[PDB]
Amino acid sequence: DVSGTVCLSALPPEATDTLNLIASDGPFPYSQDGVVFQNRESVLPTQSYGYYHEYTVITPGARTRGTRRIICGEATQEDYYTGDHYATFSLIDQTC
């Protein structure tokens, strides 16, 4: 399941950057950005294969991609934030 809705303004500013990159269709800093997210664990709602895609949320100072990601669903404004490497997800509210 989804844990709730969080305003964009309440997430790390890097979440804002990522969304902006997703709006412009990149380019993205990581080549992994934009791949299918399979939702293998069924945390998110069941959808066809390819409905979800994942994008890195940069972690400052991290040498790796770190643990933060944005998962978009195909629906209008459907975007989920994970800061614990897909353990949990919050829907992002871009209006606040």
PDB file of C-alpha atoms in Angstrom:
ATOM      1  CA  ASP A   1       0.000   0.000   0.000  1.00  0.00           C
ATOM      2  CA  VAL A   2       0.580   3.715  -0.252  1.00  0.00           C
ATOM      3  CA  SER A   3       1.308   5.497   3.014  1.00  0.00           C
ATOM      4  CA  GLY A   4      -0.559   8.821   2.507  1.00  0.00           C
ATOM      5  CA  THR A   5      -0.017  11.949   0.518  1.00  0.00           C
ATOM      6  CA  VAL A   6       2.779  14.445   1.168  1.00  0.00           C
ATOM      7  CA  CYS A   7       2.978  18.006  -0.287  1.00  0.00           C
ATOM      8  CA  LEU A   8       5.876  18.462  -2.722  1.00  0.00           C
ATOM      9  CA  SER A   9       7.013  21.384  -0.537  1.00  0.00           C
ATOM     10  CA  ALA A  10       7.470  18.904   2.388  1.00  0.00           C
ATOM     11  CA  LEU A  11       9.871  16.607   0.451  1.00  0.00           C
ATOM     12  CA  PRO A  12      13.616  17.262  -0.171  1.00  0.00           C
ATOM     13  CA  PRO A  13      14.089  19.938  -2.870  1.00  0.00           C
ATOM     14  CA  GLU A  14      15.746  17.275  -4.972  1.00  0.00           C
ATOM     15  CA  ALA A  15      12.239  15.740  -5.323  1.00  0.00           C
ATOM     16  CA  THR A  16      11.268  19.031  -7.036  1.00  0.00           C
ATOM     17  CA  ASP A  17      14.237  18.744  -9.431  1.00  0.00           C
ATOM     18  CA  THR A  18      13.272  15.226 -10.479  1.00  0.00           C
ATOM     19  CA  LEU A  19       9.653  16.176 -11.165  1.00  0.00           C
ATOM     20  CA  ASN A  20      10.958  19.006 -13.321  1.00  0.00           C
ATOM     21  CA  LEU A  21      13.129  16.652 -15.203  1.00  0.00           C
ATOM     22  CA  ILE A  22      10.169  14.242 -15.666  1.00  0.00           C
ATOM     23  CA  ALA A  23       8.054  17.203 -17.043  1.00  0.00           C
ATOM     24  CA  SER A  24      10.749  18.101 -19.641  1.00  0.00           C
ATOM     25  CA  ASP A  25      11.407  14.435 -20.393  1.00  0.00           C
ATOM     26  CA  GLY A  26      14.991  14.860 -19.146  1.00  0.00           C
ATOM     27  CA  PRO A  27      17.768  14.595 -19.646  1.00  0.00           C
ATOM     28  CA  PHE A  28      18.351  12.734 -16.487  1.00  0.00           C
ATOM     29  CA  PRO A  29      21.503  12.373 -14.456  1.00  0.00           C
ATOM     30  CA  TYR A  30      21.340   8.506 -14.183  1.00  0.00           C
ATOM     31  CA  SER A  31      20.904   6.066 -17.033  1.00  0.00           C
ATOM     32  CA  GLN A  32      18.478   4.016 -14.792  1.00  0.00           C
ATOM     33  CA  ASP A  33      16.106   6.989 -14.845  1.00  0.00           C
ATOM     34  CA  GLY A  34      12.974   6.192 -16.769  1.00  0.00           C
ATOM     35  CA  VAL A  35      13.127   2.331 -16.647  1.00  0.00           C
ATOM     36  CA  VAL A  36       9.866   0.258 -15.946  1.00  0.00           C
ATOM     37  CA  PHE A  37       9.233  -0.152 -12.183  1.00  0.00           C
ATOM     38  CA  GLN A  38       7.839  -3.672 -11.988  1.00  0.00           C
ATOM     39  CA  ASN A  39       6.013  -3.294  -8.570  1.00  0.00           C
ATOM     40  CA  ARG A  40       7.070  -6.963  -7.954  1.00  0.00           C
ATOM     41  CA  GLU A  41       6.161  -6.741  -4.325  1.00  0.00           C
ATOM     42  CA  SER A  42       2.694  -5.324  -4.941  1.00  0.00           C
ATOM     43  CA  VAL A  43       3.297  -2.281  -2.652  1.00  0.00           C
ATOM     44  CA  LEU A  44       1.611  -0.108  -5.233  1.00  0.00           C
ATOM     45  CA  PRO A  45      -1.648  -0.867  -6.870  1.00  0.00           C
ATOM     46  CA  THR A  46      -1.706  -3.638  -9.408  1.00  0.00           C
ATOM     47  CA  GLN A  47      -1.369  -2.302 -12.975  1.00  0.00           C
ATOM     48  CA  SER A  48      -0.103  -3.634 -16.292  1.00  0.00           C
ATOM     49  CA  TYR A  49       3.659  -3.987 -16.853  1.00  0.00           C
ATOM     50  CA  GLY A  50       5.096  -0.550 -17.875  1.00  0.00           C
ATOM     51  CA  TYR A  51       2.445   1.511 -15.984  1.00  0.00           C
ATOM     52  CA  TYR A  52       5.157   2.526 -13.445  1.00  0.00           C
ATOM     53  CA  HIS A  53       8.583   4.038 -14.132  1.00  0.00           C
ATOM     54  CA  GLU A  54      11.229   5.037 -11.744  1.00  0.00           C
ATOM     55  CA  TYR A  55      13.505   8.071 -11.417  1.00  0.00           C
ATOM     56  CA  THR A  56      16.294   8.945  -9.021  1.00  0.00           C
ATOM     57  CA  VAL A  57      15.891  11.654  -6.353  1.00  0.00           C
ATOM     58  CA  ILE A  58      19.542  12.691  -5.752  1.00  0.00           C
ATOM     59  CA  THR A  59      20.810  12.255  -2.244  1.00  0.00           C
ATOM     60  CA  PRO A  60      23.410  15.085  -1.649  1.00  0.00           C
ATOM     61  CA  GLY A  61      26.882  13.829  -0.988  1.00  0.00           C
ATOM     62  CA  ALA A  62      25.902  10.223  -2.058  1.00  0.00           C
ATOM     63  CA  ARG A  63      28.426   8.461  -4.225  1.00  0.00           C
ATOM     64  CA  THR A  64      25.600   6.143  -5.436  1.00  0.00           C
ATOM     65  CA  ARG A  65      22.014   6.584  -6.620  1.00  0.00           C
ATOM     66  CA  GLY A  66      21.147   6.277  -2.921  1.00  0.00           C
ATOM     67  CA  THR A  67      17.627   5.476  -1.619  1.00  0.00           C
ATOM     68  CA  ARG A  68      15.280   8.128  -2.918  1.00  0.00           C
ATOM     69  CA  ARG A  69      13.123   7.717  -5.945  1.00  0.00           C
ATOM     70  CA  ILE A  70      10.149   9.004  -7.684  1.00  0.00           C
ATOM     71  CA  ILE A  71       7.781   6.358  -9.233  1.00  0.00           C
ATOM     72  CA  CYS A  72       5.275   7.766 -11.740  1.00  0.00           C
ATOM     73  CA  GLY A  73       2.038   5.884 -12.580  1.00  0.00           C
ATOM     74  CA  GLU A  74       0.454   6.635 -15.995  1.00  0.00           C
ATOM     75  CA  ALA A  75      -2.509   8.537 -14.433  1.00  0.00           C
ATOM     76  CA  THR A  76      -2.576  12.323 -14.287  1.00  0.00           C
ATOM     77  CA  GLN A  77      -0.502  13.503 -11.245  1.00  0.00           C
ATOM     78  CA  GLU A  78       0.135   9.968 -10.037  1.00  0.00           C
ATOM     79  CA  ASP A  79       3.627  10.147  -8.586  1.00  0.00           C
ATOM     80  CA  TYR A  80       4.998   8.362  -5.597  1.00  0.00           C
ATOM     81  CA  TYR A  81       7.951   9.204  -3.394  1.00  0.00           C
ATOM     82  CA  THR A  82      10.154   6.622  -1.708  1.00  0.00           C
ATOM     83  CA  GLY A  83      12.966   7.620   0.567  1.00  0.00           C
ATOM     84  CA  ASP A  84      13.733   4.056   1.878  1.00  0.00           C
ATOM     85  CA  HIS A  85      14.528   2.298  -1.331  1.00  0.00           C
ATOM     86  CA  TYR A  86      10.976   1.121  -2.179  1.00  0.00           C
ATOM     87  CA  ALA A  87      10.104  -0.071   1.364  1.00  0.00           C
ATOM     88  CA  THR A  88       7.312   2.612   1.586  1.00  0.00           C
ATOM     89  CA  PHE A  89       5.647   5.162  -0.752  1.00  0.00           C
ATOM     90  CA  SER A  90       3.796   8.369  -0.422  1.00  0.00           C
ATOM     91  CA  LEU A  91       1.736   9.987  -3.163  1.00  0.00           C
ATOM     92  CA  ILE A  92       3.147  13.402  -4.060  1.00  0.00           C
ATOM     93  CA  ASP A  93       0.766  16.328  -3.990  1.00  0.00           C
ATOM     94  CA  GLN A  94       2.240  18.955  -6.422  1.00  0.00           C
ATOM     95  CA  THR A  95      -0.366  21.548  -5.415  1.00  0.00           C
ATOM     96  CA  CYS A  96       1.233  22.236  -1.930  1.00  0.00           C
TER      97      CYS A  96
END
